Design a protein around this nucleic acid. Structure first.
Ligand SMILES: [Mg+2]
Ligand SMILES: [Mg+2]
Ligand SMILES: [Mg+2]
Ligand SMILES: [Mg+2]
Ligand SMILES: [Mg+2]
Ligand SMILES: [Mg+2]
Ligand SMILES: [Mg+2]
Ligand SMILES: [Mg+2]
Ligand SMILES: [Mg+2]
Ligand SMILES: [Mg+2]
Ligand SMILES: [Mg+2]
Ligand SMILES: [Mg+2]
Ligand SMILES: [Mg+2]
Ligand SMILES: [Mg+2]
Ligand SMILES: [Mg+2]
Lengths: 70, 94, 102, 156, 120, 85
RNA sequence: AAAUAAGGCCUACUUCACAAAGCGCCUUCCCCCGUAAAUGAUAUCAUCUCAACUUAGAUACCCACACCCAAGAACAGGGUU
RNA sequence: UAGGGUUUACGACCUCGAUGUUGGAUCAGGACAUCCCGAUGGUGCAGCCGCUAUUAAAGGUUCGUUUGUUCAACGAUUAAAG
RNA sequence: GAUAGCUGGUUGUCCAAGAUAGAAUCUUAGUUCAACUUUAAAUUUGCCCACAGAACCAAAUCCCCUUGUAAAUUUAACUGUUAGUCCAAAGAGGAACAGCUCUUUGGACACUAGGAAAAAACCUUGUAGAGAGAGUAAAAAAUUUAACACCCAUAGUAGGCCUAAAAGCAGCCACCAAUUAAGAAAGCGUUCAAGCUCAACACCAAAAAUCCCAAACAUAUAACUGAACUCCUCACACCCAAUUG
C-alpha cells in the first residue's frame, strides 16, 4: 500500500540507508521486514506532512530529528 | 504519413521541438546557482592595490624549481653490476 | 540559411528554452476584486413647479394614440382651456414620495 | 471559513492524526522493554544482519558464503569481526541503526576460506573501418568468507 | 562573430536585498572560495578550457580553493557559468600543525578541525 | 536519490566523508584494529594537502596585507619628513 | 428489353464430336451522414441539440491393394452392386 | 495568409568496375482540386437545358483517320470519353 | 618487371603524442614552401594579464606588470596533414529558397558515453578494469475567438443654385429650428417622388496518392527514474583518421 518514490524518500529521511538489492531480497524472503519498513515510511511521511502543515512547534516528529555527527 | 524534408535538425524546415517542465526546472535552478555565484563575486578583499607583490617569491621559487628540473634532463647512469649479473643466465648446479 | 527570412525561422533548442523560461508571469490576486465591493436639476425644478401649480392635474395612459391622434388631442385641449404634460417617472418618484403623496 | 462537503471540499486521502508525544514515548519505551526481555529470554532463532562490506550490502543470515572482488591481505583461516551493520532481526522483531548500529549490540564472526581469482575475463574494442582492434585479458583477485554466527546482547 | 563575452560593472554589485537573502556581508568578507566545477569544459570556447585547466578543475565535483583577489575574481568570472562558488568560513581557528590529519570539508563550507567519528 | 541530505549538511552522496565509509569496515576477532585502507589514506593525504594549501594562502594574504600597511606607513613617514627642512 | 463485370452449361446455333469453347442460353439482392422539422433556456423574444429528446434516421457453398473418372501436372478427390 | 512537388528550371547528395531512354499492348494499386449514376442551399431557378458550394471513388471512363513522338487536328457515339 | 598526377591491396600483441591561415605551380584528382604534429637536447619566459597607450575622410582587437599556472623560444631530424561537413552571428550572389557556392569568431563531426523515435553536425558528459553498489548532467508539448441588451417615429418643407428632375443620397452652400422632448438626413430602395431602418427621448481554416499508427488515464499529498559524469575495496600504460616515438 505504498509507492516507490515516496517509500524511497521516507526511507532516506530517516538515516536508514539501504540499497535496492537488500530491499528486494527482504521483500522476497522477509515480508514482515518489508511491512515494518513500509509502516515506518508511512509514519515518516505523515510526520513530514504534519510538520509542513503546522511547522511543528514543538514536536519535530518523534521519528524525525536526524542524529547529528561530528 | 508525416513526410518532412531530409534531416529533421537542419534545413529550411525542422521538426518543432517543445520544452517540458524538466528543462524549465533545470534552467531555473541553474539560473539560481548563477545568481548565487554572481552575488558571491561582488565583494573583493585586496582591491588590487594591496596585491602588487605579496606572493611573487613563491612564483619565482616555483619557476626556479621547474628550471632546475628541466635542466636536470640528462641520460641515466650505468653500472657493471647488471652487466655482470646478465651472465647468470647459464647458472649451473653441481 | 540567411539571417532574415520571409517565414518564421525555427529557433535553436537553447534559444527556445530561454524564451520559454523568460516568459511573462502576471500577478496572482489572492482574492480578485471582481468578487469584492445638470439637466436633472432642471427636471427637478420643473417637477416642483408643476407640483406647486397642479390645482387640477390628471393622469392617463396615452400610448396607443398615433401622432395625428396626439395632435387632435392637443387641438381639443387647446379648444377648452387646458394643457398637457409628459415627464419621466425616475425623476418623479422621489418627488412623489417626498410630497406626502403615498 | 466553513466549506460544505463536496467532491473537492476536502482532499481525497484520509486525514489521519498522530498521537500525543508523551504516550508515544511511553509506548516506545514499553516495546523496547518487551524486546529486551524477549532477547534476554533467548527466544530469537537464526539471526540475520545486513553487513555493508566491500561497499556492498549483503543480506547475511548464517553459514552463508560471500565472494569479494579484491584482496584483503589476510591468511586463509583467521577470524574476522565485521561492523557497519544496520538491519538485524529474526522473527517478531527487528533492529536497525541510524544508520550503523552499536558495536556492543551486534557481533558478526567471519572467517577466510580461500583467495582465488576471477575467470579469464576478455576485454575487446572495435570500430568501423578505423582499424581499431584492441584486446586484453584480466584476472582480478577474489576471496571467500563464511559468517560463523551473529551474536547479540541486551544492550538497549 | 562570437567574440570574447565580457561582463559590465553593474552585474557584480551586491545590494542590501542580496545580502539579506544570503548570509554574506560586506564588512569583513570571506578570504577564500570553494570552487567546484559543475559543468564540463566541452562545448565551450578554447580560452575557457585554458582557464579551467589553469584553475585546476579537471575532475568535476571536486573542491578547490583560490585567492579572493581581483585577478582570481576575474579568472573565476570568466567561467562562472561552469563552476560553483561558495565561501570558506572556518568556525574555529585555522588548521594548526596539530590539526592536519583529522579534518573535513563538509558541505556549506565548514572546515572542521576536530573531525571525529562519534555521535553528539 | 535524495537531495534533502544537503539541507542537513550530511553530504549529498551517502558515501561521502560519512560514518558509513570513513569508519573501518572489518576488524580482527581479538579486537585489534585492521590496517588503514589505501583509499582512506589517499583521502587523508588529500585533506592534509588541502589544509596546507589553505593555510599557505591565508599566510600569504596576511603577509601581503602587512606589507601594504608597512608601505603605506613608510610613504606617510617619508611625506612627513619631506614636509620639514 | 440491351450492354457492362462476375457466377454456370451443350439440349437446340456455330468451331466440331465420344470433349471443350463462344457468336448460343440462365442468374446477380442491403441504407451510406449531405440536409430539411415538435419542445426552451444561457439569450423568460426567437432558436434543429459542439445542452438535454424524437423524424426519411444478414442474407449465401462448408463442419462422418487395384480399375474408371466429367477430379487431377504429382499429391489429392468421387464411383467401382 | 495556407497545401502541392504533377510543367520549366535550380543544387550534384549514394547510384558512368551500368538505374537499359517515349509512346503503344495485358494488368491495373491509390488520392479527389468529382465528368456521370445518390442527396442538398442559392441562383440573372415559370420546367429541361444551365452556374455555383459540400458529401459519396462501391462503378464506368468508346470506336477510327495522320504525323515515330504523351501532347498535337478531325468524323460518330453514350449520362461521362477527368 | 616500360611509363602512368589513376582503381585495388600492402600480414603478430600492447602504451603514448597526435586535424592544417596561405602562396606558387601548362596548376586546383598531383607537387614544393609555409603552417599543424612527432622525437633528443640547451635556454626562460608562454596564455587570461591593469592604469594607460592604438585615425580626419556594435559585438570588438593589440601590448599588458601582481595573479592562476607550466608552459614557451631555439637547435638536429624526418614521415604525415595542405579536396572538408553542420550549427549560432557578420556576410557576400541567388528568390530577405535549396542537405545552394566562398570567408571571419566559437563549437561539433571524422573518438568512445547517456538522450531528443530511427540521426555526424542538436542537449549533457571525456583518461579508459572489475563488483549482483551509491549520488548526479541532458531527458515526456501545449491549446479551441464569434449572437446580443433587437423598446420605437409630428413638422416650418419638395431650403436655395443647376437640375424640364435630385425633394434626403448626379454635384455645391449654410446646416436654423417649431414638435413638450432630438438629423435640411447616418443606411437601405426609388429616373422621380413613394416605402423600410438608425441617431433621441416614456418603464426601456483545411487537402496527394501501399494502410491512421506506441497502449493509455483530467481527481492519494514534489518527488522519483535517468551515463563510460563523481564516490565506494584493489591496482592503474591498457577506448582517435594519416603519421611518429
Ligand atoms: Mg528526410
Ligand atoms: Mg554528387
Ligand atoms: Mg552513371
Ligand atoms: Mg564506369
Ligand atoms: Mg553497379
Ligand atoms: Mg469532395
Ligand atoms: Mg608498374
Ligand atoms: Mg596531370
Ligand atoms: Mg576503387
Ligand atoms: Mg601478405
Ligand atoms: Mg591518446
Ligand atoms: Mg608556365
Ligand atoms: Mg558544394
Ligand atoms: Mg566522425
Ligand atoms: Mg572517470
Amino acid at each position: 500500500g505504498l509507492k516507490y518514490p515516496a517509500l524511497i524518500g521516507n526511507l532516506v529521511k530517516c538515516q536508514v540507508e539501504l540499497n535496492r538489492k537488500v530491499l528486494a531480497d527482504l521483500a522476497i524472503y522477509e515480508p514482515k521486514t518489508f511491512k515494518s519498513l513500509a509502516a515506518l515510511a508511512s509514519r515518516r511521511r505523515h510526520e513530514g506532512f504534519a510538520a509542513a502543515l503546522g511547522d511543528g512547534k514543538e514536536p519535530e516528529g518523534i521519528f524525525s530529528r536526524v542524529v547529528q555527527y561530528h | 504519413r508525416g513526410r518532412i524534408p531530409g534531416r529533421q535538425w537542419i534545413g529550411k524546415h525542422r521538426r518543432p521541438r517543445f520544452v517540458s517542465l524538466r528543462a524549465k526546472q533545470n534552467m531555473i535552478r541553474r539560473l539560481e546557482i548563477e545568481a548565487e555565484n554572481h552575488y558571491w563575486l561582488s565583494m573583493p578583499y585586496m582591491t588590487r592595490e594591496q596585491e602588487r607583490g605579496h606572493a611573487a617569491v613563491r612564483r619565482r621559487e616555483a619557476f626556479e624549481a621547474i628550471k632546475a628540473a628541466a635542466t636536470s634532463k640528462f641520460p641515466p647512469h650505468r653500472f657493471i653490476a647488471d652487466q655482470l649479473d646478465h651472465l647468470n643466465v647459464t647458472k649451473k648446479w653441481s | 540559411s540567411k539571417a532574415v527570412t520571409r517565414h518564421r525561422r525555427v529557433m535553436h533548442f537553447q534559444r527556445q528554452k530561454l524564451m520559454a523560461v523568460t516568459e511573462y508571469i502576471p500577478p496572482k490576486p489572492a482574492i480578485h476584486p471582481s468578487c469584492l465591493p445638470g439637466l436633472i436639476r432642471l427636471l427637478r425644478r420643473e417637477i416642483a413647479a408643476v407640483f406647486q401649480d397642479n390645482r387640477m392635474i390628471a393622469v392617463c395612459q396615452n400610448v396607443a394614440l398615433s401622432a395625428e391622434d396626439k395632435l387632435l388631442m392637443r387641438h381639443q385641449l387647446r379648444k377648452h382651456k387646458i394643457l398637457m404634460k409628459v415627464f419621466p417617472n425616475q425623476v418623479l418618484k422621489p418627488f412623489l414620495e417626498d410630497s406626502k403623496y403615498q | 471559513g466553513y466549506v460544505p462537503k463536496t467532491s473537492l471540499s476536502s482532499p481525497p486521502w484520509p486525514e489521519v492524526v498522530l498521537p500525543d508525544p508523551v504516550e508515544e514515548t511511553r509506548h516506545h519505551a514499553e516495546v523496547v522493554k518487551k524486546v529486551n526481555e524477549m532477547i534476554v529470554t533467548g527466544q530469537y532463532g537464526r539471526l540475520f544482519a545486513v553487513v555493508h562490506f566491500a561497499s556492498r550490502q549483503w543480506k547475511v543470515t548464517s553459514e552463508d558464503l560471500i565472494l569479494i572482488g579484491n584482496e584483503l591481505d589476510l591468511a586463509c583461516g583467521e577470524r574476522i569481526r565485521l561492523e557497519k551493520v544496520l538491519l538485524v532481526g529474526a522473527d517478531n522483531f527487528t533492529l536497525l541503526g541510524k544508520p550503523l548500529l552499536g558495536k556492543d549490540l551486534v557481533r558478526v564472526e567471519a572467517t577466510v576460506i580461500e583467495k582465488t581469482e576471477s575467470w579469464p575475463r576478455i576485454i575487446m574494442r572495435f570500430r568501423k573501418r578505423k582499424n581499431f582492434k584492441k584486446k586484453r585479458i584480466v584476472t582480478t583477485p577474489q576471496t571467500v568468507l563464511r559468517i560463523n554466527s551473529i551474536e547479540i546482547a541486551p544492550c538497549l | 562573430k562570437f567574440t570574447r563575452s565580457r561582463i559590465p560593472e553593474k552585474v557584480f554589485q551586491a545590494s542590501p536585498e542580496d545580502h539579506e537573502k544570503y548570509g554574506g556581508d560586506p564588512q569583513n568578507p570571506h578570504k577564500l572560495h570553494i570552487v567546484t566545477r559543475i559543468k564540463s569544459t566541452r562545448r565551450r570556447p578554447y580560452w575557457e578550457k585554458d582557464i579551467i585547466k589553469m584553475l585546476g578543475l579537471e575532475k568535476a565535483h571536486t573542491p578547490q580553493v583560490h585567492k579572493n583577489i581581483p585577478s582570481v575574481n576575474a579568472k573565476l568570472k570568466v567561467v562562472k557559468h561552469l563552476i560553483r562558488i561558495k565561501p570558506l568560513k572556518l568556525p574555529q581557528g585555522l588548521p594548526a600543525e596539530e590539526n592536519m590529519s583529522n579534518t573535513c570539508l563538509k558541505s556549506t563550507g565548514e572546515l572542521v578541525v576536530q573531525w571525529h567519528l562519534k555521535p553528539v | 536519490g535524495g537531495q534533502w541530505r544537503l539541507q542537513q549538511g550530511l553530504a549529498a552522496n551517502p558515501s561521502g566523508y560519512g560514518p558509513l565509509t570513513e569508519l573501518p569496515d572489518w576488524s580482527y576477532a581479538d579486537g585489534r584494529p585492521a590496517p588503514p585502507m589505501k583509499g582512506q589514506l589517499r583521502r587523508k593525504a588529500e585533506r592534509e594537502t588541502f589544509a596546507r594549501r589553505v593555510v599557505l594562502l591565508s599566510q600569504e594574504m596576511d603577509a601581503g596585507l602587512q606589507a601594504w600597511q608597512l608601505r603605506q606607513q613608510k610613504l606617510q613617514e617619508e611625506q612627513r619628513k619631506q614636509e620639514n627642512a
